């Protein structure tokens, strides 16, 4: 769905939403498009192990440096493991193959760090982390459901983009969480802050597509 997201962003950005007449941004809000999932917390320990994250439903996941993935459901015991070849298996923290001991231990550490520390973003209407990268200004998180989340480090603003809803959720500096239909942003416009971040988003989606 990355190509679909790129086309949706091309379209909003070509409409010059902050550059025409009266902006009626509120008329572009669509609460029926609120995301089901987003990333509420993350820990980059990629110099050694990988990227650990919490989703807004309190489930956790890790994308390990070897491109395997472990996902802990919010029941606190049920696990999904995804091997390098895509094979998915189900198990629990209590009942697992000995070969997963190290990875399960690592997940417990990430999980405990994100339970004890850090603020839950978006404090909804499982996807796993397909890929991520960081720039100087942001971290870019691409979920397997097609959603792309962009967290800006300096000002703590965030975008959650969903190509299925063709929607963007913008979390501003005050932590106000508004969800917009992209095509309604074309129709009604938006502020220059949101417009700039959507221009950036397009560049990030191009980076995802060109590196997938």
């Amino acid at each position: 769905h990355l190509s679909d997201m790129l086309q949706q962003l091309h379209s909003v950005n070509a409409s010059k939403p902050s550059e025409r007449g009266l902006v009626r941004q509120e008329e572009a809000e669509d609460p029926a498009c609120i995301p089901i999932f987003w990333v509420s917390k993350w820990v980059d320990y990629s110099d050694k192990y990988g990227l650990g994250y919490q989703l807004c439903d309190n489930s956790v996941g890790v994308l390990f440096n070897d491109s395997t993935r472990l996902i802990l459901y919010n029941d606190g015991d049920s696990l999904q493991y995804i091997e390098r070849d895509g094979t998915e298996s189900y198990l629990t923290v209590s009942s697992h193959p000995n070969s997963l001991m190290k990875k399960i231990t690592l997940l417990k550490y990430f999980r405990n760090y994100m339970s004890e520390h850090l603020l839950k973003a978006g404090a909804p209407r499982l996807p796993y982390l397909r890929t991520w990268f960081r720039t100087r200004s942001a971290i870019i998180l691409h979920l397997s459901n097609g959603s792309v989340q962009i967290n800006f480090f300096q000002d703590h603003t965030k975008l959650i983009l969903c190509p299925l809803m063709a929607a963007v959720t913008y979390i501003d500096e005050k932590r106000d969480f508004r969800t917009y239909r992209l095509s309604l942003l074309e129709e009604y416009g938006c502020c220059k802050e949101l417009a700039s971040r959507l221009r950036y988003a397009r560049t990030m989606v191009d980076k995802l597509l060109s590196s997938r």
Binding site: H117, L118, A121, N151
Partner: peptide, 5 residues
């Protein structure tokens, strides 16, 4: 940053 807020 190496972790979220």
């Amino acid at each position: 940053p190496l972790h979220s807020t």
